[PDB]
Amino acid sequence: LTNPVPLNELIARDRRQPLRFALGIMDEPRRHLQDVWGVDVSGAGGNIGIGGAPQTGKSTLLQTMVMSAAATHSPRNVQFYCIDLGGGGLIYLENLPHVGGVANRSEPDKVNRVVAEMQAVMRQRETTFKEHRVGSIGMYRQLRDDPSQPVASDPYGDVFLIIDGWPGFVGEFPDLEGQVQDLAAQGLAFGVHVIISTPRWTELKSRVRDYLGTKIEFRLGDVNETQIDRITREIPANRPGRAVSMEKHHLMIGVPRFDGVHSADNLVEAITAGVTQIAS
Ligand SMILES: Nc1ncnc2c1ncn2[C@@H]1O[C@H](COP(=O)(O)OP(=O)(O)OP(=O)(O)O)[C@@H](O)[C@H]1O
């Protein structure tokens, strides 16, 4: 599809599910139908890897993901921490109560504090789950919905670390790579998630990439480097927002706006209007 669907229409057309974030439109070609596509982050799809050549729509998808999550979940249950090294676009998400912080190049201390905070949660969750005899993240999410449970005082729910621009991240923060690897491989059992974009899959090493259970792939510089399959060869050139994912169906990512406008024009202004509208 060429014109992106705005989030207000995607949310409205979607059958909502806890920890389902609607993201765009999936062409399901056997029958002629085109439904709302999203990600289930409640289980093994909880970590997400995003690949694609320059200007293909990686940062916009992250904006759409966070806005979509924030429009359909409470800030008590979903929190995002953002490391923005992919164009600066994540800053316009920071006034959402779901977003605990957006860190960029101009404040390296915050990039370090953000990773350290994700580690603190996962590492507190490990002790908490044992001491409170919590059998699974699924059970932990239920217990937190009961205000009489000791665990319900945890202000955190499912916590997502977003890294837009992996090679620049490892390039400027080499010692944080190992900490993020540990979050990706151990976090999901404790409700700690990792979401990473990269221009090339080869720059996102196995030991991290293998723990991103949902891969989303825009048009690649080298189709031989796909993390999906040969379907990626079908993505049209110069169509930002066109992607493929694990179900091997073409996708058109929607836009992070709520004003009914089917384009990515004037998006900075529309994102803020969306955040305001989400305040409901
Ligand atoms: N889902 C979409 N629908 C329509 N147009 C889009 C979509 N996503 C992105 N675009 C257009 O493509 C442009 C580049 O998008 P974006 O900044 O998301 O690319 P990127 O993958 O983050 O690139 P880079 O690696 O250079 O940061 C956007 O400014 C927007 O105008």
Ligand SMILES: [Mg+2]
């Ligand atoms: Mg970008």
